[PDB]
Amino acid sequence: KKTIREKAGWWSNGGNEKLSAFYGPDRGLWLGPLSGTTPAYLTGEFPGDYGWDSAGLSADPETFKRYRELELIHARWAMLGALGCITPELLAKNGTPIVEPVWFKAGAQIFAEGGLDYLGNPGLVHAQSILATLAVQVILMGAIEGYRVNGGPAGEGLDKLHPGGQFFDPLGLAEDPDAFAELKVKEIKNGRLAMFSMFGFFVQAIVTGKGPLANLDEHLASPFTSNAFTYAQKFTPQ
Amino acid sequence: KKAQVISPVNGDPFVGMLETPVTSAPIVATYLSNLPAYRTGVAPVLRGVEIGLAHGFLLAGPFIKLGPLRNVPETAEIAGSLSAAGLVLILALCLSIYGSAQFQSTPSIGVKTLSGRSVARDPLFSADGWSEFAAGFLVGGEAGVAWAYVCTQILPYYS
Amino acid sequence: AAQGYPFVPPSWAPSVFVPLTGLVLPAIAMATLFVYIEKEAP
Amino acid sequence: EASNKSFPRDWVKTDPLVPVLGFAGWTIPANIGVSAFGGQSLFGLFTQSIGENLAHFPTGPALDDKFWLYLITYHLGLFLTITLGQIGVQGRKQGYW
Amino acid sequence: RRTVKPASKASTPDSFWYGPERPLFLGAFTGEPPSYLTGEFPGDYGWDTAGLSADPETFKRYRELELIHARWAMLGALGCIFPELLGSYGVPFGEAVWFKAGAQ
Amino acid sequence: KYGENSRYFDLQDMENTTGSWDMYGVDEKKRYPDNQAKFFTQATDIISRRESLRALVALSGIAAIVTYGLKGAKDADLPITKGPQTTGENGKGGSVRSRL
Ligand SMILES: CC1=C[C@H](O)CC(C)(C)[C@H]1/C=C/C(C)=C/C=C/C(C)=C/C=C/C=C(C)/C=C/C=C(C)/C=C/C1=C(C)C[C@H](O)CC1(C)C
Ligand SMILES: CC1=C[C@H](O)CC(C)(C)[C@H]1/C=C/C(C)=C/C=C/C(C)=C/C=C/C=C(C)/C=C/C=C(C)/C=C/C1=C(C)C[C@H](O)CC1(C)C
Ligand SMILES: CC1=C(/C=C/C(C)=C/C=C/C(C)=C/C=C/C=C(C)/C=C/C=C(C)/C=C/C2=C(C)CCCC2(C)C)C(C)(C)CCC1
C-alpha cells in the first residue's frame, strides 16, 4: 500500500501512527498476543502501559498515580545508578587508577586514610569524613526533594514528574508533544530496564561477590562453564 | 524502410538539439533525471551535499595515487586527501562567486518538460539557492574527502 | 632581529609569504575582480 | 523528418530472439574444431584460457597469453553476427529489401 | 525525459504472456490450446496434452501444486549448487555435494 | 496550440516556441531521508550565505597555507624545507671560472 522508502522508515514528522504501539487500545502488551483482558484502568493513556497489573495493586486511580510517580522516580535513580555502577569499573579496566571501582565496595574507599579520591586522583574531591559527606548530602537532598514534591526555585506550578521548564528541559527536546509522548516511553522503558538491571546488580553482588563487569567478563570467557547456576549451591542450608 | 530514430527536439525542427539515443534513450533520460542536479523540487543544499560527497570522494584518488608523495606508504593517502580538501575548498569558492555573478537578471521566460506542462524554476538557480548549494557542496566534499581517507584505511582490498 | 638590524624577516617568512603570494592573494584578487566584473549596474 | 515528433522509446526494435540467434550462429561454428587450432576450437580455446586465467583471478591475463587473441576474434565475429542479425531481422520486418 | 502517460489508453499493450495471443509450448505447432487454458494464469503455454486439469478446480489445485513445487525447487537448486560451488573454492564442508550432505 | 499541424510558433506558448524546456528535471519533493536532510540542512546553516561561506573559505585556506608553510611542508618532508644536505653547486660557477 506504501512505497519502498516509506516502508524503510524515511520522512520524519510522519508520526501519529507511531504512538499507536505505545498508547491507545491496540498497543503492545506485557504478554504480547497472549494478554487478552487488560485491566480496565490501564486504558493506554500513560507511558509504559503494557497492561501489567496481575496483582491489581493499581486498581485505585489515585494510588495508580502515586505508583506511577514511584515508578518514574525509581527508574531515574536506577538509571543513574546503573550507569554509576559500571562507569568506575569500565574506567578502571581502561586504566584510570580508581582504588575500588567495584560499586558495592566503592563506599569503603572513604575509610582509607588517603581519603576518597574521585577518579583515584588525590587532587580531586579527596573526601575523608563520611559523616560530613552524609550531612552535606542530607541537607542538599532534603532541599532538593522537598522542592521536587511541591515546587522550588526551579519552577513551582510545574508537573510533578515532567516539570520541563528551563531547568529540567534546557535542551528543549520535549517541545513537540508527540516527541514528548514517545520520549516518555523511552524514559520509562530505559528506566525499567535499569531497575531490573539494578536488581540484577544487587543479586549478583549478594550471590557472586564480584563486580558486574567482572561477571560479564567471566561469563564471556566460558558462558556454559560459568553461569548463575555455578552459584546455585552457594546458599545451601548446612 | 521505416522507423527513423533521430528526431528534432520535442518535435521542433528549428530549436536545434536533435533528440537522439544518447540524449533521450529512456535509460539515459532516467539516469540523468535521477541525478541530484535535475531534482528540481529537492532543496539545493542537499543536492549540493550529495554532489560534493561524490566529487570529493572521487577526486582524492588522483591526488593519492599520482601526487608527489604517492610513493610514501602512510603519507600518500594523507597528502592526497589534503590536496583534495584544498581543491574542494577552491571549488566551493568558485561556486560561491558564480552564484554572486550569475543570479542578478532574473530570467522571465517559463520552463516546460518536453510534454507541455510548465514547471517552476529550479530554486537552485537563484542567489539563495546557489549559496546554500555551495555550502552543501563544501560540507559534502570535505566529508567525502575524509571518507576517502577512511576508505584508504578501512577497506580490506585497498592497495 | 637581535641587534644587527631590526625588522629582519624570520626564517619561516618565505614558506608563508610565497603561498600567500601565489595562492591566496591571487584567489582573493581574482574572486573580487570577478564579482566586480560580472556585477550588474542598477 | 515529418515523423518522429517525440523520439519513440522503442528506438531499438528489440527482438529477444536476435541475441540468442547471433550467439548460436557464431558460437556453434566457433565450437567446430579445425586443423589450425590443433584440433581444438576458437570457443573451446577461449573458454580454456578463461579458465586458466580465472585460476589466478586478481592477476589479469598477460600480454603473451593468447587469451586476448581468442577474446578479440570471438567477439569480432560475435558482435558482427549479432548486429547483422538485428539489421537483417529489422530489415525483413521493415522494408530495406 | 518525458512523463509516461497512464494506462486508460494502454490497458493491455504489454500483455504478452496472457490473453489469446500468448506464447505456447509448441510455438506455431500448438494450434489452439484447450478451451480452459485461456491465458489468464501465468506460464500458460497451453500444455495440457493429458487433460489432467480439464476441471477448473483441479486446475486451481494443480496451479497451487506447481507454484509451491516451483518455489521449493528453486530453493533446492540454489541449495544444491551453492555448497558445492563454494566447496570448489576452499570452504571445507563435510560433504559439499547435495546427495551426500545429509549424512554429514 | 503548438504541436498542431506543424505550428511551431505560439504567442501564448513562448516556452515551447523558444525551446525553454527542462529536458531532465523532475520536481518530486521526495529524495532523501528526512533525518539526513535535517542533519545536512543544519550542518550548512551557518555557511548557507555567500558571506559566511567565503569567510569560512578564507579562514580555512589562509590557515591551511600558513600551517603548510610553517608545519605542513616540513611534515610532508619537502626538499625545499630539508635544505640542500650538500655543499651544493657553490664553487662551480662556470666551466671556465669556477666561481663561488
Ligand atoms: C509491574 C507489576 C505488576 C504486578 O501487578 C505487580 C508487581 C509484580 C509487583 C509489579 C512489578 C514490580 C516490579 C518488578 C518492581 C521492581 C522494582 C525494582 C527492580 C526496582 C529497582 C530499583 C533500583 C534502584 C532505585 C537503583 C538505584 C541505584 C542507585 C541509587 C545507585 C547508587 C549507587 C551507585 C551508583 C554505585 C555506588 O558505588 C553506590 C550506590 C550508592 C549503590
Ligand atoms: C505440464 C504437464 C502437462 C501435461 O498435460 C501432463 C504432464 C506431462 C504430466 C504435465 C507435466 C508435468 C511435469 C513435467 C512435472 C514435473 C515435475 C517436477 C520435475 C518436479 C520437481 C520438483 C522438484 C523439487 C520440489 C525440488 C526440491 C528441492 C529441494 C527441497 C532441495 C532440498 C535439498 C537441498 C537444497 C540439497 C540438500 O543437500 C538436501 C535436500 C534436502 C535434498
Ligand atoms: C571462426 C571459426 C570458423 C568460422 C566461423 C564462421 C565463418 C562463422 C560464421 C557465422 C555466421 C555466418 C553465422 C550466421 C548465422 C545466420 C543465422 C543464424 C540465420 C538465421 C535465420 C533465421 C533464424 C530466420 C528467421 C526468420 C525467418 C525465417 C523470417 C522472418 C522471421 C525470422 C526471424 C523468424 C571456423 C569454422 C573456421 C572454425 C573456428 C571458428
PDB file of C-alpha atoms in Angstrom, chain A residues 32-164:
ATOM      1  CA  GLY A  32       2.020  -9.735  23.674  1.00  0.00           C
ATOM      2  CA  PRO A  33      -0.588 -11.770  21.813  1.00  0.00           C
ATOM      3  CA  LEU A  34      -1.203 -13.791  24.991  1.00  0.00           C
ATOM      4  CA  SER A  35      -2.640 -10.983  27.151  1.00  0.00           C
ATOM      5  CA  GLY A  36      -6.290 -10.528  26.330  1.00  0.00           C
ATOM      6  CA  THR A  37      -8.092  -8.853  29.197  1.00  0.00           C
ATOM      7  CA  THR A  38      -6.077  -5.836  30.206  1.00  0.00           C
ATOM      8  CA  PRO A  39      -7.217  -4.128  33.410  1.00  0.00           C
ATOM      9  CA  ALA A  40      -9.845  -1.557  32.548  1.00  0.00           C
ATOM     10  CA  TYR A  41      -7.924   1.147  34.403  1.00  0.00           C
ATOM     11  CA  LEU A  42      -4.884   0.624  32.156  1.00  0.00           C
ATOM     12  CA  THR A  43      -6.535   2.428  29.270  1.00  0.00           C
ATOM     13  CA  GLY A  44      -3.268   3.093  27.450  1.00  0.00           C
ATOM     14  CA  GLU A  45      -3.015   6.788  28.283  1.00  0.00           C
ATOM     15  CA  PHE A  46       0.163   6.715  30.281  1.00  0.00           C
ATOM     16  CA  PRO A  47       3.650   5.844  29.053  1.00  0.00           C
ATOM     17  CA  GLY A  48       4.824   2.299  29.543  1.00  0.00           C
ATOM     18  CA  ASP A  49       1.292   0.908  29.693  1.00  0.00           C
ATOM     19  CA  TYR A  50       1.711  -2.753  28.771  1.00  0.00           C
ATOM     20  CA  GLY A  51      -1.341  -3.920  30.700  1.00  0.00           C
ATOM     21  CA  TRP A  52       0.619  -5.472  33.573  1.00  0.00           C
ATOM     22  CA  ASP A  53      -1.258  -5.301  36.860  1.00  0.00           C
ATOM     23  CA  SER A  54      -1.505  -9.013  37.625  1.00  0.00           C
ATOM     24  CA  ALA A  55      -1.659  -8.187  41.336  1.00  0.00           C
ATOM     25  CA  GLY A  56      -4.287  -5.471  40.890  1.00  0.00           C
ATOM     26  CA  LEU A  57      -2.305  -3.092  43.086  1.00  0.00           C
ATOM     27  CA  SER A  58      -3.121  -0.044  40.920  1.00  0.00           C
ATOM     28  CA  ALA A  59      -6.888  -0.509  40.877  1.00  0.00           C
ATOM     29  CA  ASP A  60      -7.472   2.804  42.635  1.00  0.00           C
ATOM     30  CA  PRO A  61      -6.651   5.665  40.238  1.00  0.00           C
ATOM     31  CA  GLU A  62      -5.021   7.777  42.947  1.00  0.00           C
ATOM     32  CA  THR A  63      -2.736   5.022  44.177  1.00  0.00           C
ATOM     33  CA  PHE A  64      -2.119   4.336  40.491  1.00  0.00           C
ATOM     34  CA  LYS A  65      -0.885   7.917  40.209  1.00  0.00           C
ATOM     35  CA  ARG A  66       1.315   7.543  43.275  1.00  0.00           C
ATOM     36  CA  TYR A  67       2.669   4.269  41.900  1.00  0.00           C
ATOM     37  CA  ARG A  68       3.412   5.913  38.561  1.00  0.00           C
ATOM     38  CA  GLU A  69       5.422   8.602  40.320  1.00  0.00           C
ATOM     39  CA  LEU A  70       7.204   5.972  42.404  1.00  0.00           C
ATOM     40  CA  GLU A  71       7.984   4.036  39.234  1.00  0.00           C
ATOM     41  CA  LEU A  72       9.411   7.002  37.370  1.00  0.00           C
ATOM     42  CA  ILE A  73      11.499   8.249  40.284  1.00  0.00           C
ATOM     43  CA  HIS A  74      12.835   4.763  40.960  1.00  0.00           C
ATOM     44  CA  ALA A  75      13.513   4.497  37.239  1.00  0.00           C
ATOM     45  CA  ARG A  76      15.532   7.693  37.109  1.00  0.00           C
ATOM     46  CA  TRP A  77      17.514   6.830  40.229  1.00  0.00           C
ATOM     47  CA  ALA A  78      18.112   3.334  38.868  1.00  0.00           C
ATOM     48  CA  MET A  79      19.294   4.669  35.533  1.00  0.00           C
ATOM     49  CA  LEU A  80      21.804   6.922  37.255  1.00  0.00           C
ATOM     50  CA  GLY A  81      22.802   4.010  39.463  1.00  0.00           C
ATOM     51  CA  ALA A  82      23.193   1.519  36.646  1.00  0.00           C
ATOM     52  CA  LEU A  83      25.427   3.975  34.836  1.00  0.00           C
ATOM     53  CA  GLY A  84      27.388   4.731  38.013  1.00  0.00           C
ATOM     54  CA  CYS A  85      27.924   1.105  38.996  1.00  0.00           C
ATOM     55  CA  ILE A  86      29.611   0.401  35.648  1.00  0.00           C
ATOM     56  CA  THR A  87      31.418   3.659  34.851  1.00  0.00           C
ATOM     57  CA  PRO A  88      34.119   3.272  37.538  1.00  0.00           C
ATOM     58  CA  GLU A  89      34.822  -0.364  36.691  1.00  0.00           C
ATOM     59  CA  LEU A  90      34.987   0.363  32.967  1.00  0.00           C
ATOM     60  CA  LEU A  91      37.275   3.320  33.613  1.00  0.00           C
ATOM     61  CA  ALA A  92      39.454   1.193  35.895  1.00  0.00           C
ATOM     62  CA  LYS A  93      39.842  -1.621  33.374  1.00  0.00           C
ATOM     63  CA  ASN A  94      40.652   1.026  30.769  1.00  0.00           C
ATOM     64  CA  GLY A  95      43.340   2.243  33.162  1.00  0.00           C
ATOM     65  CA  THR A  96      42.126   5.016  35.465  1.00  0.00           C
ATOM     66  CA  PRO A  97      43.659   4.439  38.925  1.00  0.00           C
ATOM     67  CA  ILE A  98      40.420   4.132  40.875  1.00  0.00           C
ATOM     68  CA  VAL A  99      41.238   2.446  44.163  1.00  0.00           C
ATOM     69  CA  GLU A 100      37.992   0.447  44.469  1.00  0.00           C
ATOM     70  CA  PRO A 101      35.881   0.569  41.324  1.00  0.00           C
ATOM     71  CA  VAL A 102      33.502  -2.209  42.329  1.00  0.00           C
ATOM     72  CA  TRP A 103      30.295  -0.498  43.323  1.00  0.00           C
ATOM     73  CA  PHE A 104      29.340  -2.404  46.463  1.00  0.00           C
ATOM     74  CA  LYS A 105      32.876  -1.748  47.713  1.00  0.00           C
ATOM     75  CA  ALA A 106      33.070   1.838  46.436  1.00  0.00           C
ATOM     76  CA  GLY A 107      31.687   3.194  49.697  1.00  0.00           C
ATOM     77  CA  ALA A 108      34.526   1.739  51.754  1.00  0.00           C
ATOM     78  CA  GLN A 109      37.068   3.938  49.974  1.00  0.00           C
ATOM     79  CA  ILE A 110      36.348   6.807  52.372  1.00  0.00           C
ATOM     80  CA  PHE A 111      37.819   4.869  55.304  1.00  0.00           C
ATOM     81  CA  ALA A 112      41.257   4.602  53.751  1.00  0.00           C
ATOM     82  CA  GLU A 113      43.418   7.370  55.144  1.00  0.00           C
ATOM     83  CA  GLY A 114      44.195   8.663  51.660  1.00  0.00           C
ATOM     84  CA  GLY A 115      40.532   9.546  51.531  1.00  0.00           C
ATOM     85  CA  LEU A 116      38.066   9.119  48.702  1.00  0.00           C
ATOM     86  CA  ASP A 117      39.906  10.419  45.684  1.00  0.00           C
ATOM     87  CA  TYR A 118      37.285  10.771  42.990  1.00  0.00           C
ATOM     88  CA  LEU A 119      38.909   9.190  39.921  1.00  0.00           C
ATOM     89  CA  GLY A 120      41.780   7.918  42.012  1.00  0.00           C
ATOM     90  CA  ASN A 121      43.299  11.399  41.860  1.00  0.00           C
ATOM     91  CA  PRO A 122      44.147  12.912  45.272  1.00  0.00           C
ATOM     92  CA  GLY A 123      43.908  16.420  43.857  1.00  0.00           C
ATOM     93  CA  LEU A 124      40.206  15.799  43.283  1.00  0.00           C
ATOM     94  CA  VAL A 125      37.374  15.617  45.842  1.00  0.00           C
ATOM     95  CA  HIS A 126      39.584  13.986  48.491  1.00  0.00           C
ATOM     96  CA  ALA A 127      36.796  13.234  50.953  1.00  0.00           C
ATOM     97  CA  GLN A 128      37.801  11.792  54.321  1.00  0.00           C
ATOM     98  CA  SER A 129      34.743  12.253  56.553  1.00  0.00           C
ATOM     99  CA  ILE A 130      31.823  10.002  55.702  1.00  0.00           C
ATOM    100  CA  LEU A 131      29.745  11.811  58.309  1.00  0.00           C
ATOM    101  CA  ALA A 132      30.351  15.233  56.789  1.00  0.00           C
ATOM    102  CA  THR A 133      29.645  13.743  53.373  1.00  0.00           C
ATOM    103  CA  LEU A 134      26.366  12.324  54.649  1.00  0.00           C
ATOM    104  CA  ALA A 135      25.401  15.602  56.327  1.00  0.00           C
ATOM    105  CA  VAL A 136      26.046  17.656  53.204  1.00  0.00           C
ATOM    106  CA  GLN A 137      24.103  15.056  51.257  1.00  0.00           C
ATOM    107  CA  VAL A 138      21.162  15.034  53.643  1.00  0.00           C
ATOM    108  CA  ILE A 139      20.837  18.815  53.623  1.00  0.00           C
ATOM    109  CA  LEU A 140      21.098  19.051  49.854  1.00  0.00           C
ATOM    110  CA  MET A 141      18.844  16.115  49.012  1.00  0.00           C
ATOM    111  CA  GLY A 142      16.216  17.182  51.527  1.00  0.00           C
ATOM    112  CA  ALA A 143      16.049  20.626  49.983  1.00  0.00           C
ATOM    113  CA  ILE A 144      16.108  19.016  46.541  1.00  0.00           C
ATOM    114  CA  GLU A 145      13.297  16.524  47.139  1.00  0.00           C
ATOM    115  CA  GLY A 146      11.109  18.946  49.063  1.00  0.00           C
ATOM    116  CA  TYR A 147      11.466  21.229  46.078  1.00  0.00           C
ATOM    117  CA  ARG A 148      10.554  18.270  43.883  1.00  0.00           C
ATOM    118  CA  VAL A 149       7.344  17.396  45.700  1.00  0.00           C
ATOM    119  CA  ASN A 150       5.751  20.868  45.840  1.00  0.00           C
ATOM    120  CA  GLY A 151       7.966  23.334  43.952  1.00  0.00           C
ATOM    121  CA  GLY A 152      11.003  25.481  44.403  1.00  0.00           C
ATOM    122  CA  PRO A 153      13.462  27.862  42.767  1.00  0.00           C
ATOM    123  CA  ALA A 154      13.275  25.851  39.524  1.00  0.00           C
ATOM    124  CA  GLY A 155       9.532  26.193  38.970  1.00  0.00           C
ATOM    125  CA  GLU A 156       6.561  25.685  41.276  1.00  0.00           C
ATOM    126  CA  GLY A 157       3.496  25.320  39.061  1.00  0.00           C
ATOM    127  CA  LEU A 158       5.034  22.523  37.013  1.00  0.00           C
ATOM    128  CA  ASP A 159       4.230  18.843  36.636  1.00  0.00           C
ATOM    129  CA  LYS A 160       5.280  16.528  39.443  1.00  0.00           C
ATOM    130  CA  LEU A 161       7.119  14.134  37.113  1.00  0.00           C
ATOM    131  CA  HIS A 162       7.990  16.154  33.999  1.00  0.00           C
ATOM    132  CA  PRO A 163       8.412  19.770  35.114  1.00  0.00           C
ATOM    133  CA  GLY A 164      10.150  20.747  31.919  1.00  0.00           C
TER     134      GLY A 164
END
